[PDB]
Amino acid sequence: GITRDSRHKRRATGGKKNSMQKKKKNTMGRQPANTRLGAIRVHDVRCRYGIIKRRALRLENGNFSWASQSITKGTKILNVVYNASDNDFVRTNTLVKGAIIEIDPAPFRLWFLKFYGKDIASTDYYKSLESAQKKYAKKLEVLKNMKFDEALLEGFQSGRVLACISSRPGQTGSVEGYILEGKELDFYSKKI
Amino acid sequence: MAEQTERAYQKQVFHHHSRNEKGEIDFGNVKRYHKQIGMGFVTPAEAIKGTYIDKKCPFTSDVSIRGRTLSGIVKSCH
Amino acid sequence: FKGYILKITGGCDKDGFPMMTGVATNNRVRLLLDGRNGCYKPLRNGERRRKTVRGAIVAGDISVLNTGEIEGVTNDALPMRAGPKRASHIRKLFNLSQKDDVKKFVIRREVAKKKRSKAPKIQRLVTPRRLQHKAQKLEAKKLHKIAMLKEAKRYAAILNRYKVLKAHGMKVVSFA
RNA sequence: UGUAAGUUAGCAAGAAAGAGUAGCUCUGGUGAUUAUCGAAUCAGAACUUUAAAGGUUAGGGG
RNA sequence: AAACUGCGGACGGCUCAUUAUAACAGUAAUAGUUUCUUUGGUUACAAGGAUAGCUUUGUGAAUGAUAAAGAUAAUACUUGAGACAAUUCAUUCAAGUGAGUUAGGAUGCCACGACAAUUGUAGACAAGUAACCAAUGAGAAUUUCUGAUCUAUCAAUCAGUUGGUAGU
RNA sequence: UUCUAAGGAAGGCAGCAGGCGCGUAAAUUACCCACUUUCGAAUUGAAGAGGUAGUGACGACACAU
């Protein structure tokens, strides 16, 4: 099968490399699994030394961390909008590390309502700051100091926030990501 | 501003946010990470003050310097 | 004769090659066989072999068809052999409750030669050693509970006996 | 992609020889004016089928 | 005795075809990986099915060939109280080492999840088991520097080829 | 390459002995786990590893006439 040895390559001088042995299991490679988007489907791979790798063939949900608010919420994945390596990965909705995806910010908005008493999905969000169990007014003044990037708010109101997958679904069998923020969101939004 | 010339976003291996003057984490900036390599080598000023991003730089990444150490003269810079 | 209803459950080809339930043809085919379906018995662990088998559809080439039973099929009967050994199996076949003893009903067989009423070895009863199996093996978590476990916090207290003492910028703490 | 003997070194040479080509849905490269506007051309990827220059025009080769 | 289960047949034994910086020798790294075995440690008065040897019916010329039915065990296959451990990701406080946002701690989250529902009446004490650390391990595997016979009637070679970014 | 009932089937001595061929050119179809040691559920069982014997003017040492 696929091999990862360097005996089949050429030297840095361009000279061909001759053969002394045959293929061996130490340099064994495995067929890639392109984790698409859909119904959950994972497989167990017996790796070397008996350890087990979780090969995620298809996934739909994932846990995403909001860095600023210090929470992590499970969420359904909607679409893959930008893959920095191959444009084919955008159409096929292949889940890989560093793939900018879109998820519905329902639990994050719900968490924000309970934790804060306001709703990001409100188009009058900044106006609702000026206009006011009853101790939520103490928390109310945190936003008159800290602000969100505009592109995040548009995703909240449109129901599609941008997140970056930060795990290896073909190795760990799961999608772990994080919501993009100030400097990263501007860069990745101009790409789209 | 000038180092983001690739398709992906360029970040250091250890990118961390610095605290605000009020004493809490400010998520609006990233600390420029730089370390000191070992056996009597000084870290250049550009590794401290510069804004370049490199994941293989011995001063701004997690690549270590191991036992073998040689000297030579530059041949090509292409 | 009158005839009953029968379901075909096996059979062999004219050449002794068996028939596979999954195989849905008439002629003979060759499959990569392991011991899961049966028609091949492996020697090594995880060893497969390409053997030839027959299809599930009956045809004229079949020499024997398993579709000779417990003491002479026609109209007959006789049975027994190898009663239960697990204690929980003893209760169910003899209408025995949970509390009542079973050894008054355990199957016994005689021996006749040139004597002995042998019996199986009961498994998972409430018998003396087996009742106390806890206190013999399953209790005595001392290896983890009383000797271990508390030793963590028993020996964790060392974080203050001389650990913080040394942390006071002194030279060396005496044992006493 | 590959191309011999021979040679007046210019040629032989379209040598010989092999592969690809359709439809549909997309992706990317090549500019102008300072976000708007415009050109046919090239490259690539999934899917489908009756597997694609051949209706017409259109070298047999050594 | 046979049979299930466990372990081993990846060691040893033979040969030198391949192999021209390939392999090998000395050296150095693994802060770029790591098992097995062995050794130190750390974390319900007991449940559920079916399977061989066994018995019975057989086929084929035949293989270390094989088909049906009837039962029966587990330290085989499962569930289940007994109360953490190690995985991924995000954020953060940071002490040995030449050198590490490093061993480690904290927060939030997902997956995984126990210390046999085990065995000696005799040689209370053994014995067995699951994960997680450390040693075995200057081991295994990759990799660093230097070192190979003849040949110019072999002078130019290379297109994954050389480097970068993201991934697999 | 071998068995075959002609329907089909297994096998890989560059393992220890041994045979054919090849060449100027190279030994027994032996005995045993008693030494060294490996494996195993283990103080015991196996081991053509290993040991002993057989052929041996490749060689090396001492020694008759």
Q: CA C9, CA A179: separation in Å to the nearest integer? A: 61
Q: Which tokens belong to C63?
A: 């020499």
Give yes or no for a contact between A75 and A85, defined as CB atoms under 8 angstroms apart: no
The answer to whether B9 contacts A85, with C-beta atoms less than 8 Å apart, is no
Q: How far apart are CA B15 and CA C86, in angstroms?
A: 63
Kindly report the length of chain B.
78
Chain B positions touching A182 (Cβ under 8 A) are 27-28
Contact A99, A81 (CB under 8 A): no
Choose the mutation target among B3, B4, B9 for the interface with A, i.e. most A CBs under 10 Å: B9
Confirm if A62 and A70 have CB atoms less than 8 A apart: no
From residue C55, alpha-carbon distances to B5, C24, C59 in Å are 66, 6, 9
For residues C89 and C96, the answer to whether their CB atoms sit within 8 Å is no
**Which of B15, B18, B7 is closest to B53 using CA atoms?**
B15
CB-nearest to B7 from A68, A84, A182 is A84
Query: From CA A45, how far away is CA A64, in angstroms rounded?
Result: 26
Q: How was this structure determined?
A: cryo-EM
Q: How far apart are CA A173 and CA A178, in angstroms?
A: 17
- State both tokens at A104: 């519905």
Facing residue for A184 by CB, picked from B6, B7, B9: B9
A59 in Cβ contact with A95 (< 8 Å)? yes
Helix axes A150-158, A182-191, angle to 10 degrees: 70
CA A21/CA B9 separation, integer angstroms: 43
Cα separation of A107 and A120, whole Å?
12
What is the C-alpha separation between A121 and A19, in angstroms, rounded? Answer: 64
In this complex, do A98 and B4 lie within 8 Å of one another by their Cβ atoms?
no
